[PDB]
Write a structure and sequence with these properties.
beta lactamase like fold, structural genomics, unknown function, 3 helices, 8-stranded antiparallel sheet, alpha+beta, DUF2874, 140 residues
Length: 140
Amino acid sequence: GGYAPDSVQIALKKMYPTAAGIAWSQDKAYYVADFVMNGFDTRVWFTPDAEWVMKQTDWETLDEVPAAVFNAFAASEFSDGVVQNVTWVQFPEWQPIVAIQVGKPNMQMKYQILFTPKGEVLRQQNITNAYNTLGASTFL
């Protein structure tokens, strides 16, 4: 479902031959493939020239993250919060990123923290009432 040029669809098939029920959408000048891979929600961004520029895997839980990220999150001011999502963000040339979305229900605030695999904080964003916080505008 959704539109994507044939070249872009062929490029995704080459990367994930077992991918089924793919939903295509646009995010700025990118085509985004949305599907389930190994039980995880997966999204792949493509240029119109069928070059992949970003991958996202919704791990959802902290038991999937590198131990350095787990320990940095556990020592942070968000450790007591409700984890809403955990995403492994990858790129063709750049280092991967762990994006954690955590709610503070008593504070009535939602936050997004971007970590390097070594546990270094790249960004602490207040995403209360914000949408598409993991799209091309955050990473590309």
